[PDB]
Amino acid sequence: GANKTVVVTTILESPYVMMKKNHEMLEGNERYEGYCVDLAAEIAKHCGFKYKLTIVGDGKYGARDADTKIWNGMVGELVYGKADIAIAPLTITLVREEVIDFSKPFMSLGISIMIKKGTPIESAEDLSKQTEIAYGTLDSGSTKEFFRRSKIAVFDKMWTYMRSAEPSVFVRTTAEGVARVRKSKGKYAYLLESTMNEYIEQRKPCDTMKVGGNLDSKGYGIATPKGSSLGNAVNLAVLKLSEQGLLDKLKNKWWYDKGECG
Amino acid sequence: GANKTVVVTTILESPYVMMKKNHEMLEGNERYEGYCVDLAAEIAKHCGFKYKLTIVGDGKYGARDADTKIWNGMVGELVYGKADIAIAPLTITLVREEVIDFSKPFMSLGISIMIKKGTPIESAEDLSKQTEIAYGTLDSGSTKEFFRRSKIAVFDKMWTYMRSAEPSVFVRTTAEGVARVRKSKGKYAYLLESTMNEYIEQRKPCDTMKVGGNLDSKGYGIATPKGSSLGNAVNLAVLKLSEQGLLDKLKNKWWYDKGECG
Ligand SMILES: O=C1CCCN1Cc1ccc(-n2nc(C(F)(F)F)c3c2CCCC3)cc1F
Ligand SMILES: N[C@@H](CCC(=O)O)C(=O)O
Ligand SMILES: N[C@@H](CCC(=O)O)C(=O)O
Ligand SMILES: [Zn+2]
Ligand SMILES: [Zn+2]
Ligand SMILES: [Zn+2]
Ligand SMILES: [Zn+2]
């Protein structure tokens, strides 16, 4: 039947989506800016739909509760029919691919280490071989599941530590992890995606840094509910944006053009 | 009905598929080795099929003739029903995605520059601003189409040069491009995928090198004909291999463990 306004689920995560200063009482999509705001506009333009940006209600990426089996976060909003599409730094994973559809990736990333400058840590192996410096991840996302599932000896040992460390090494939001690194005088390191890490490293007060290689190699994808009418066209649009150089332009706009650290 | 042996199309391209020394008169899959031989074995194991490796008849990746509209290469073998699956360093592109299905990527890569050591070239911009050093690409693949289509000013200018340069700057196989770099005393540079470039840079006689950043950012995917019964299971298998660390193991086996240049 008639076209409907597509409900887009996304998450307040710098530099992907941020509320514009003093727009708290304005209306609609114009309230937000960032990489995924720009990406949403292009994907809608190429696919021919109108859309509304909405912030995921529970502030989470998406994980399945072990007991209840209920999906939360943006994945949940797609699975239970609360949104039509997720346009966010949402990691393509097997367990998610089983319940929702992903486009081809629009970014690359890997899990990485953030330290406060001067922290004597250069690698995951370094972190795993000491106990003075605490370390954790975001509490309900793909990074935590990576450690939970890994059979690689260094990551397995890291998980054995994190899962029972006190106080909890896990955080609710990327911002909380970053703030914890910055206030802990070097006694907390944060495990997060390289994209987020590299962004923060170029933001004032310029006191964090990415160290070592990425622990893995994966992508973000645009997600739709299984059997969505949008999935095919969205996939082709991602490839077009890739080949036209648009995804590279948006990366350079929101990371490197935004740099504050010289 | 009953399961059939899956016909796999692939291409002789180091280190993805190579004929084992002195096996020219042996039979079957045991004749071949390499990254994509190992990947094929895992994808078949996870998906529960038997398979035969075959080398694409025309030795090409896959492009659509502008006049006849016929697809050649591995893409053609899928489009005309000559193979069931392509497991090769086959680039995910829009024009291909329109006629065949790709899995999520199993590698990353970008177009890159190979020079003979000592060549005074550090970038695509350098190449584009001079005429003493010739440069080209593989004649029937995604790199050539990248230059043909680009509207980025440096790449557009490079394409204007390559398309009418004499003798032809284009080559039939990656090996021919590499040999041309090595014999040209620095007067030919070769535009090829970073994966291939980085492999060759660690092989004797250790006289080539990758220079500058990648020009783009994309992936290889496993390809199946549209409506194949294999596509879904193959996609999920790629994600599993990614998350289990298997794709990283295979990369380190065929690139860095294979290094000859110290
Ligand atoms: O190592 C592995 C195996 C599992 C995934 N991954 C890393 C990885 C991440 C992203 C990309 N792609 N692919 C494409 C494309 F669809 F081809 F256009 C693009 C990207 C990066 C973003 C722009 C386009 C490719 C990758 F290989
Ligand atoms: N991108 C992650 C969230 C960030 C993280 O887990 O590090 C996800 O989709 O779950
Ligand atoms: N991977 C390329 C071939 C190599 C190249 O074009 O540089 C393709 O799929 O067409
Ligand atoms: Zn405004
Ligand atoms: Zn566009
Ligand atoms: Zn043998
Ligand atoms: Zn396996």
Coordinates of C-alpha atoms and ligand atoms in Angstrom, one line a residue:
Chain A
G1 CA 0.0 0.0 0.0
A2 CA 1.0 3.7 0.5
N3 CA 4.5 4.5 1.6
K4 CA 4.9 5.1 5.4
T5 CA 7.5 7.1 7.3
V6 CA 10.3 4.8 8.2
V7 CA 11.1 4.6 11.9
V8 CA 14.9 4.7 12.3
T9 CA 16.4 3.5 15.5
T10 CA 19.8 4.9 16.5
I11 CA 21.9 5.6 19.6
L12 CA 23.5 8.7 21.1
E13 CA 27.1 7.8 20.4
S14 CA 29.8 10.3 19.3
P15 CA 30.4 11.1 16.5
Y16 CA 27.6 9.0 15.0
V17 CA 24.6 10.8 16.5
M18 CA 24.6 13.8 18.9
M19 CA 21.9 16.3 19.9
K20 CA 22.7 19.7 18.4
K21 CA 23.4 22.3 21.1
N22 CA 20.2 24.1 22.2
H23 CA 17.8 22.1 20.0
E24 CA 16.3 20.2 23.0
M25 CA 12.9 21.9 22.3
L26 CA 13.0 21.8 18.4
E27 CA 11.3 19.1 16.5
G28 CA 12.3 16.2 14.3
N29 CA 15.5 15.1 12.6
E30 CA 17.0 18.6 12.6
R31 CA 17.7 18.1 16.3
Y32 CA 20.5 15.6 15.6
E33 CA 23.9 15.6 13.8
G34 CA 26.7 13.2 13.1
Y35 CA 28.0 10.5 10.8
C36 CA 24.9 8.3 11.1
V37 CA 22.6 11.3 10.7
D38 CA 24.4 12.1 7.4
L39 CA 24.4 8.4 6.4
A40 CA 20.6 8.1 7.2
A41 CA 19.9 11.1 4.8
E42 CA 21.8 9.5 2.0
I43 CA 20.3 6.0 2.4
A44 CA 16.8 7.5 2.5
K45 CA 17.6 9.7 -0.6
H46 CA 18.9 6.7 -2.6
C47 CA 16.1 4.3 -1.5
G48 CA 13.3 6.9 -1.8
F49 CA 11.8 6.9 1.7
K50 CA 10.9 9.5 4.3
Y51 CA 12.1 8.8 7.9
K52 CA 12.0 9.8 11.5
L53 CA 15.1 9.4 13.7
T54 CA 14.4 8.0 17.1
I55 CA 16.8 7.2 19.9
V56 CA 16.7 3.6 21.2
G57 CA 14.5 3.6 24.3
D58 CA 16.9 1.6 26.6
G59 CA 20.1 3.2 25.3
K60 CA 21.6 -0.2 24.3
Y61 CA 23.0 -1.9 21.2
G62 CA 21.4 -5.2 21.5
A63 CA 21.9 -8.5 23.4
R64 CA 19.7 -11.5 24.1
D65 CA 19.0 -12.1 27.9
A66 CA 20.3 -15.7 28.7
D67 CA 17.3 -16.5 30.9
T68 CA 14.3 -14.7 29.3
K69 CA 15.6 -14.9 25.7
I70 CA 14.4 -11.3 25.1
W71 CA 16.4 -9.0 22.8
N72 CA 17.1 -5.5 24.1
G73 CA 18.6 -2.4 22.5
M74 CA 18.3 -1.5 18.8
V75 CA 18.2 -5.2 17.9
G76 CA 15.2 -5.6 20.1
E77 CA 13.4 -2.7 18.6
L78 CA 13.8 -4.4 15.2
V79 CA 12.9 -7.9 16.4
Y80 CA 9.7 -6.7 18.2
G81 CA 8.6 -4.4 15.4
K82 CA 9.2 -1.1 17.2
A83 CA 11.5 0.3 14.4
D84 CA 11.9 -0.4 10.7
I85 CA 15.6 0.1 10.4
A86 CA 18.7 0.7 12.6
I87 CA 21.3 3.1 11.3
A88 CA 24.0 3.2 13.9
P89 CA 27.5 1.8 14.8
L90 CA 25.9 -1.6 15.1
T91 CA 28.3 -4.5 14.8
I92 CA 27.6 -7.3 12.4
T93 CA 27.6 -10.5 14.4
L94 CA 26.5 -14.1 13.9
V95 CA 24.0 -14.1 16.8
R96 CA 22.4 -10.9 15.4
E97 CA 22.5 -12.1 11.8
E98 CA 20.3 -15.0 13.0
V99 CA 17.4 -12.7 14.0
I100 CA 17.9 -9.5 11.9
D101 CA 19.3 -8.7 8.4
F102 CA 22.5 -6.6 7.9
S103 CA 23.6 -4.7 4.9
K104 CA 27.2 -5.1 3.7
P105 CA 29.4 -3.1 6.1
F106 CA 29.6 0.7 5.8
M107 CA 32.6 0.9 8.2
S108 CA 35.4 -1.2 9.4
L109 CA 36.5 -1.6 13.0
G110 CA 38.1 -3.8 15.5
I111 CA 38.2 -4.0 19.3
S112 CA 41.0 -1.8 20.6
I113 CA 42.6 -0.6 23.8
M114 CA 42.2 2.9 25.2
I115 CA 44.6 4.1 27.9
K116 CA 45.2 7.4 29.8
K117 CA 48.4 8.8 28.4
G118 CA 51.5 7.4 30.2
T119 CA 49.8 4.1 31.2
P120 CA 52.4 1.4 30.9
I121 CA 50.3 -0.9 28.7
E122 CA 51.0 -1.5 24.9
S123 CA 48.9 -4.7 24.3
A124 CA 46.1 -7.0 25.4
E125 CA 48.9 -9.4 26.4
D126 CA 50.3 -6.7 28.7
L127 CA 46.8 -6.1 30.2
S128 CA 46.3 -9.9 30.8
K129 CA 49.7 -10.3 32.6
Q130 CA 49.1 -7.8 35.4
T131 CA 46.5 -6.8 38.0
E132 CA 47.3 -3.2 39.0
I133 CA 45.4 -1.8 36.0
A134 CA 41.7 -2.7 35.8
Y135 CA 40.0 -3.0 32.4
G136 CA 36.5 -3.5 31.1
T137 CA 34.1 -3.1 28.2
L138 CA 30.6 -1.8 27.4
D139 CA 28.2 -4.0 29.4
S140 CA 25.7 -5.1 26.6
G141 CA 27.4 -5.2 23.1
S142 CA 29.6 -7.1 20.8
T143 CA 32.8 -6.4 22.6
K144 CA 31.6 -8.1 25.8
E145 CA 30.4 -11.1 23.8
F146 CA 33.8 -11.3 22.0
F147 CA 35.5 -11.8 25.4
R148 CA 32.8 -14.0 26.7
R149 CA 33.2 -16.3 23.6
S150 CA 36.9 -16.2 22.9
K151 CA 39.0 -19.3 23.1
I152 CA 42.2 -17.4 22.3
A153 CA 44.3 -17.8 25.4
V154 CA 45.1 -14.0 26.1
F155 CA 41.4 -13.0 25.6
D156 CA 40.1 -16.0 27.6
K157 CA 42.3 -15.0 30.5
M158 CA 41.1 -11.3 30.2
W159 CA 37.5 -12.6 30.3
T160 CA 38.2 -14.7 33.4
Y161 CA 39.4 -11.5 35.1
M162 CA 36.7 -9.1 33.9
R163 CA 33.8 -11.4 34.6
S164 CA 34.5 -11.5 38.4
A165 CA 36.4 -8.2 39.0
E166 CA 35.1 -5.9 41.7
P167 CA 34.0 -3.2 41.4
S168 CA 32.4 -4.1 38.0
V169 CA 34.7 -3.2 35.1
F170 CA 31.8 -2.9 32.8
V171 CA 30.1 0.4 31.9
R172 CA 26.7 1.5 30.7
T173 CA 27.8 3.8 27.9
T174 CA 31.0 4.5 25.9
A175 CA 31.1 8.0 27.6
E176 CA 31.2 6.3 31.1
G177 CA 34.1 4.1 30.0
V178 CA 36.0 7.1 28.6
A179 CA 35.3 9.2 31.8
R180 CA 36.5 6.2 33.9
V181 CA 39.8 6.1 32.0
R182 CA 40.3 9.9 32.3
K183 CA 39.6 10.0 36.1
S184 CA 41.4 6.8 37.1
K185 CA 45.0 8.2 37.0
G186 CA 46.0 5.3 34.6
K187 CA 44.5 2.5 36.7
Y188 CA 41.7 1.8 34.3
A189 CA 42.0 0.9 30.6
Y190 CA 38.9 0.6 28.3
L191 CA 38.2 -2.0 25.6
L192 CA 36.2 -0.4 22.8
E193 CA 35.9 -0.3 19.1
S194 CA 38.7 1.3 17.2
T195 CA 36.3 3.8 15.5
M196 CA 35.2 5.2 18.9
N197 CA 38.8 5.0 20.3
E198 CA 40.3 7.0 17.4
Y199 CA 37.6 9.6 17.6
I200 CA 38.2 10.3 21.3
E201 CA 41.9 10.4 20.9
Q202 CA 41.5 13.5 18.7
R203 CA 39.2 15.3 21.2
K204 CA 40.1 17.6 24.0
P205 CA 41.5 17.2 26.6
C206 CA 43.7 15.0 24.4
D207 CA 44.6 12.7 27.3
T208 CA 43.7 9.3 25.9
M209 CA 45.4 7.1 23.4
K210 CA 44.8 3.9 21.3
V211 CA 47.6 1.4 21.9
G212 CA 48.5 -1.9 20.2
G213 CA 46.8 -3.5 17.2
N214 CA 43.1 -4.3 16.9
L215 CA 42.0 -7.5 18.5
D216 CA 39.6 -8.4 15.7
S217 CA 38.3 -7.2 12.3
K218 CA 34.7 -6.6 11.5
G219 CA 32.2 -4.1 10.3
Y220 CA 29.1 -2.0 11.1
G221 CA 26.0 -2.7 9.1
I222 CA 22.6 -1.2 8.6
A223 CA 20.0 -3.6 10.1
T224 CA 16.5 -4.4 9.2
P225 CA 13.9 -6.8 10.5
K226 CA 13.9 -10.2 8.7
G227 CA 11.5 -9.9 5.6
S228 CA 11.6 -6.1 5.6
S229 CA 10.8 -4.6 2.2
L230 CA 13.8 -2.2 2.7
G231 CA 16.7 -4.7 3.1
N232 CA 17.6 -5.2 -0.6
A233 CA 17.6 -1.5 -1.6
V234 CA 19.5 -0.6 1.6
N235 CA 22.2 -3.1 0.8
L236 CA 22.7 -1.8 -2.7
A237 CA 22.7 1.8 -1.4
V238 CA 25.5 1.0 1.0
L239 CA 27.6 -0.3 -1.9
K240 CA 26.8 2.8 -4.0
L241 CA 27.9 5.1 -1.2
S242 CA 31.1 3.1 -0.8
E243 CA 32.0 3.2 -4.5
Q244 CA 31.0 6.9 -4.9
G245 CA 33.5 7.8 -2.1
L246 CA 30.7 9.1 0.1
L247 CA 31.5 6.9 3.1
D248 CA 35.2 8.1 3.0
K249 CA 34.0 11.8 2.9
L250 CA 31.7 11.2 5.9
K251 CA 34.6 9.5 7.9
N252 CA 36.9 12.4 7.2
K253 CA 34.1 15.0 8.1
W254 CA 33.4 13.5 11.5
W255 CA 36.8 12.2 12.6
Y256 CA 39.7 14.0 11.1
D257 CA 38.1 17.4 10.2
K258 CA 36.7 17.4 13.7
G259 CA 40.2 16.9 15.3
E260 CA 41.0 19.1 18.3
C261 CA 44.4 17.8 19.2
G262 CA 46.3 19.5 16.3
Chain B
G1 CA 16.5 -34.0 -4.0
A2 CA 19.9 -35.7 -3.3
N3 CA 23.0 -33.6 -2.4
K4 CA 25.3 -32.9 -5.4
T5 CA 29.0 -32.2 -5.5
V6 CA 29.2 -28.4 -5.4
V7 CA 31.3 -26.9 -8.3
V8 CA 33.6 -24.3 -6.9
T9 CA 35.0 -21.7 -9.3
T10 CA 38.3 -20.1 -8.3
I11 CA 41.4 -18.5 -9.8
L12 CA 45.1 -19.1 -9.8
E13 CA 46.2 -16.1 -7.7
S14 CA 48.9 -16.2 -5.0
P15 CA 48.5 -16.9 -2.1
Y16 CA 44.8 -17.7 -2.6
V17 CA 45.1 -20.8 -4.9
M18 CA 48.3 -22.3 -6.3
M19 CA 49.0 -25.7 -7.9
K20 CA 51.2 -27.8 -5.6
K21 CA 54.7 -28.5 -7.0
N22 CA 54.7 -31.8 -9.1
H23 CA 50.9 -32.5 -8.7
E24 CA 50.0 -31.7 -12.3
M25 CA 49.1 -35.3 -12.9
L26 CA 47.4 -36.0 -9.5
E27 CA 43.6 -35.7 -9.2
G28 CA 41.1 -33.5 -7.5
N29 CA 41.3 -30.9 -4.8
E30 CA 44.6 -32.2 -3.4
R31 CA 46.4 -30.6 -6.4
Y32 CA 45.9 -27.1 -4.9
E33 CA 46.9 -25.1 -1.9
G34 CA 46.4 -21.6 -0.5
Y35 CA 44.2 -19.3 1.5
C36 CA 41.1 -20.0 -0.6
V37 CA 41.8 -23.7 -0.6
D38 CA 41.7 -23.7 3.2
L39 CA 38.7 -21.3 3.3
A40 CA 36.8 -23.6 0.8
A41 CA 37.5 -26.7 3.1
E42 CA 36.1 -24.8 6.2
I43 CA 33.0 -23.4 4.4
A44 CA 32.2 -26.9 3.0
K45 CA 32.7 -28.4 6.5
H46 CA 30.5 -25.9 8.2
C47 CA 27.8 -26.0 5.5
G48 CA 27.8 -29.8 5.0
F49 CA 28.6 -30.1 1.3
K50 CA 31.1 -31.9 -0.9
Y51 CA 32.9 -29.9 -3.5
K52 CA 35.2 -29.9 -6.5
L53 CA 37.7 -27.0 -7.0
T54 CA 37.9 -25.8 -10.6
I55 CA 39.9 -23.0 -12.1
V56 CA 37.9 -20.4 -14.0
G57 CA 38.2 -21.3 -17.7
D58 CA 39.1 -17.8 -19.0
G59 CA 41.4 -16.9 -16.1
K60 CA 39.4 -13.7 -15.2
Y61 CA 37.5 -12.2 -12.2
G62 CA 34.4 -11.0 -14.0
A63 CA 33.3 -8.0 -16.0
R64 CA 30.3 -7.4 -18.3
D65 CA 31.2 -6.6 -22.0
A66 CA 29.9 -3.1 -22.9
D67 CA 28.6 -4.2 -26.3
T68 CA 27.5 -7.9 -25.9
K69 CA 26.5 -7.6 -22.2
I70 CA 27.9 -11.0 -21.5
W71 CA 29.7 -11.6 -18.2
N72 CA 33.1 -13.3 -18.2
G73 CA 35.3 -14.7 -15.5
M74 CA 34.1 -16.3 -12.3
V75 CA 31.1 -14.0 -12.2
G76 CA 30.1 -15.3 -15.7
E77 CA 30.5 -18.9 -14.5
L78 CA 28.0 -18.2 -11.8
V79 CA 25.6 -16.2 -14.0
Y80 CA 25.5 -18.9 -16.7
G81 CA 25.2 -21.8 -14.3
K82 CA 28.7 -23.2 -15.0
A83 CA 29.7 -23.2 -11.2
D84 CA 27.7 -23.2 -8.0
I85 CA 30.0 -21.0 -5.9
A86 CA 33.0 -18.7 -6.3
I87 CA 35.6 -18.9 -3.5
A88 CA 38.3 -16.5 -4.5
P89 CA 39.7 -13.0 -3.9
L90 CA 36.6 -11.7 -5.7
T91 CA 35.7 -8.1 -4.8
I92 CA 32.2 -7.1 -3.7
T93 CA 30.9 -4.5 -6.1
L94 CA 27.6 -3.0 -6.9
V95 CA 27.5 -4.1 -10.5
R96 CA 28.2 -7.6 -9.4
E97 CA 25.8 -7.6 -6.5
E98 CA 23.1 -6.8 -9.1
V99 CA 23.6 -10.2 -10.8
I100 CA 25.1 -12.5 -8.1
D101 CA 24.9 -12.8 -4.3
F102 CA 27.9 -12.1 -2.0
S103 CA 28.5 -13.2 1.6
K104 CA 29.6 -10.7 4.2
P105 CA 33.3 -10.1 3.4
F106 CA 35.9 -12.5 4.5
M107 CA 38.8 -10.1 4.0
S108 CA 39.4 -6.4 3.8
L109 CA 41.4 -4.7 1.0
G110 CA 41.9 -1.5 -0.9
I111 CA 43.5 -0.5 -4.1
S112 CA 47.2 0.2 -3.5
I113 CA 50.4 1.1 -5.3
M114 CA 53.3 -1.2 -6.0
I115 CA 56.7 0.2 -7.0
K116 CA 60.1 -1.3 -7.7
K117 CA 62.2 -0.3 -4.7
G118 CA 63.8 3.2 -5.1
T119 CA 61.0 4.5 -7.4
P120 CA 60.4 8.1 -6.6
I121 CA 56.7 7.7 -6.0
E122 CA 54.9 7.9 -2.7
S123 CA 51.2 8.4 -3.7
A124 CA 48.6 8.3 -6.4
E125 CA 48.9 12.1 -6.6
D126 CA 52.6 11.7 -7.3
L127 CA 51.8 9.2 -10.1
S128 CA 49.2 11.5 -11.6
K129 CA 51.5 14.6 -11.7
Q130 CA 54.2 13.0 -13.9
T131 CA 54.7 11.1 -17.1
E132 CA 58.1 9.4 -16.9
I133 CA 56.7 6.4 -14.8
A134 CA 53.9 4.4 -16.5
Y135 CA 51.2 2.8 -14.4
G136 CA 48.3 0.4 -15.0
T137 CA 45.9 -2.2 -13.6
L138 CA 44.6 -5.7 -14.2
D139 CA 42.6 -5.5 -17.4
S140 CA 39.2 -7.1 -16.4
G141 CA 38.5 -6.5 -12.6
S142 CA 37.3 -4.1 -10.0
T143 CA 40.4 -2.0 -9.9
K144 CA 40.1 -1.0 -13.6
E145 CA 36.4 -0.3 -13.1
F146 CA 37.3 1.9 -10.0
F147 CA 39.4 4.2 -12.2
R148 CA 36.9 4.0 -15.1
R149 CA 34.1 5.3 -12.7
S150 CA 35.9 7.6 -10.3
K151 CA 35.0 11.3 -10.2
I152 CA 37.7 12.0 -7.6
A153 CA 40.1 14.4 -9.4
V154 CA 43.4 12.5 -9.0
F155 CA 41.9 9.1 -10.0
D156 CA 40.0 10.7 -12.9
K157 CA 43.2 12.1 -14.2
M158 CA 45.0 8.8 -13.7
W159 CA 42.2 7.1 -15.7
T160 CA 42.5 9.7 -18.6
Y161 CA 46.2 8.7 -18.8
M162 CA 45.8 4.9 -18.5
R163 CA 42.9 4.6 -20.9
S164 CA 44.9 5.9 -23.9
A165 CA 48.6 5.2 -22.9
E166 CA 50.8 3.2 -25.3
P167 CA 51.9 0.5 -25.1
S168 CA 48.9 -0.7 -23.0
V169 CA 49.4 -0.2 -19.3
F170 CA 46.9 -3.0 -18.5
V171 CA 47.9 -6.6 -17.9
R172 CA 46.2 -10.1 -18.1
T173 CA 47.2 -11.4 -14.7
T174 CA 48.6 -10.1 -11.4
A175 CA 51.8 -12.0 -12.1
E176 CA 52.3 -10.1 -15.4
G177 CA 51.9 -6.8 -13.6
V178 CA 54.4 -7.8 -10.9
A179 CA 56.9 -9.0 -13.5
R180 CA 56.4 -5.7 -15.4
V181 CA 57.2 -3.7 -12.3
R182 CA 60.3 -5.9 -11.6
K183 CA 61.7 -5.7 -15.2
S184 CA 61.0 -2.0 -15.9
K185 CA 63.8 -0.5 -13.8
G186 CA 61.3 1.7 -11.9
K187 CA 59.5 3.1 -15.0
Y188 CA 56.3 1.0 -14.3
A189 CA 54.2 1.0 -11.2
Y190 CA 51.3 -1.4 -10.7
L191 CA 47.9 -0.6 -9.2
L192 CA 46.6 -3.6 -7.3
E193 CA 44.7 -4.7 -4.2
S194 CA 46.6 -4.3 -0.9
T195 CA 46.3 -8.0 -0.1
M196 CA 48.2 -9.0 -3.3
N197 CA 50.6 -6.1 -2.8
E198 CA 51.5 -7.0 0.8
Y199 CA 51.9 -10.7 -0.1
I200 CA 54.4 -9.9 -2.9
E201 CA 56.4 -7.4 -0.8
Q202 CA 57.4 -10.3 1.5
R203 CA 58.4 -12.7 -1.3
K204 CA 61.9 -13.0 -2.9
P205 CA 63.5 -11.2 -4.6
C206 CA 62.1 -8.6 -2.1
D207 CA 62.4 -5.8 -4.7
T208 CA 58.9 -4.4 -4.6
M209 CA 57.1 -2.3 -2.1
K210 CA 53.6 -0.9 -1.2
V211 CA 53.6 2.9 -1.0
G212 CA 51.1 5.4 0.2
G213 CA 47.6 4.7 1.7
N214 CA 45.0 2.6 0.2
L215 CA 42.8 4.4 -2.4
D216 CA 39.6 2.8 -1.3
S217 CA 38.2 0.3 1.3
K218 CA 36.2 -2.8 0.5
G219 CA 36.0 -6.5 0.8
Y220 CA 36.2 -9.9 -0.8
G221 CA 33.1 -12.1 -0.6
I222 CA 32.1 -15.6 -1.4
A223 CA 29.7 -15.5 -4.4
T224 CA 26.7 -17.6 -5.4
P225 CA 24.2 -17.4 -8.2
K226 CA 21.0 -15.5 -7.4
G227 CA 18.5 -18.0 -5.7
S228 CA 21.2 -20.5 -4.8
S229 CA 20.3 -22.8 -1.9
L230 CA 23.8 -22.2 -0.5
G231 CA 23.8 -18.4 0.0
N232 CA 22.3 -18.2 3.4
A233 CA 24.4 -20.9 5.0
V234 CA 27.6 -19.6 3.4
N235 CA 27.0 -16.1 4.8
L236 CA 26.5 -17.5 8.3
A237 CA 29.6 -19.7 7.9
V238 CA 31.7 -16.6 7.0
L239 CA 30.6 -14.8 10.2
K240 CA 31.4 -17.9 12.3
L241 CA 34.9 -18.2 10.8
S242 CA 35.4 -14.5 11.5
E243 CA 34.3 -14.7 15.1
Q244 CA 36.2 -18.0 15.8
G245 CA 39.5 -16.3 14.7
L246 CA 39.9 -18.7 11.7
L247 CA 40.1 -16.0 9.1
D248 CA 42.9 -14.3 11.1
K249 CA 44.7 -17.7 11.4
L250 CA 44.5 -18.2 7.6
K251 CA 45.8 -14.7 6.9
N252 CA 48.8 -15.2 9.1
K253 CA 49.5 -18.7 7.6
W254 CA 49.6 -17.5 4.0
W255 CA 51.1 -14.0 4.3
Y256 CA 53.3 -13.5 7.3
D257 CA 54.3 -17.1 8.1
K258 CA 55.1 -17.3 4.4
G259 CA 57.4 -14.3 4.5
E260 CA 60.7 -14.6 2.8
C261 CA 62.1 -11.1 3.3
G262 CA 63.0 -11.6 7.0
Ligands
LIG1 O1 38.2 -9.1 8.2 C1 37.0 -9.1 8.1 C2 36.2 -10.4 7.9 C3 34.8 -10.0 8.5 C4 34.8 -8.5 8.1 N1 36.2 -8.1 8.1 C5 36.6 -6.6 8.1 C6 35.9 -5.9 7.0 C7 35.2 -4.7 7.3 C8 34.5 -4.0 6.3 C9 34.7 -4.4 5.0 N2 34.1 -3.7 4.0 N3 33.4 -4.3 2.9 C10 32.9 -3.4 2.1 C11 32.1 -3.7 0.9 F1 30.9 -4.4 1.2 F2 32.9 -4.6 0.1 F3 31.9 -2.6 0.1 C12 33.2 -2.1 2.7 C13 33.9 -2.3 3.8 C14 34.4 -1.2 4.7 C15 33.3 -0.1 4.7 C16 33.1 0.4 3.2 C17 32.8 -0.8 2.2 C18 35.5 -5.5 4.7 C19 36.1 -6.2 5.7 F4 36.8 -7.3 5.3
LIG2 N1 29.2 -1.6 18.2 C1 28.9 -2.4 19.4 C2 28.8 -1.5 20.6 C3 30.2 -1.0 21.2 C4 31.0 -2.1 21.9 O1 30.4 -3.2 22.2 O2 32.2 -1.9 22.0 C5 27.7 -3.2 19.2 O3 27.1 -3.2 18.1 O4 27.2 -4.0 20.1
LIG3 N1 39.7 -8.7 -6.8 C1 39.6 -8.1 -8.1 C2 40.7 -8.5 -9.1 C3 42.1 -7.8 -8.8 C4 42.0 -6.3 -9.3 O1 41.1 -5.9 -10.1 O2 42.9 -5.6 -8.8 C5 38.2 -8.4 -8.7 O3 37.4 -9.1 -8.0 O4 37.9 -8.0 -9.8
ZN4 ZN 19.4 23.7 14.1
ZN5 ZN 24.3 9.8 -2.6
ZN6 ZN 50.2 -33.7 -2.5
ZN7 ZN 35.6 -24.2 11.3

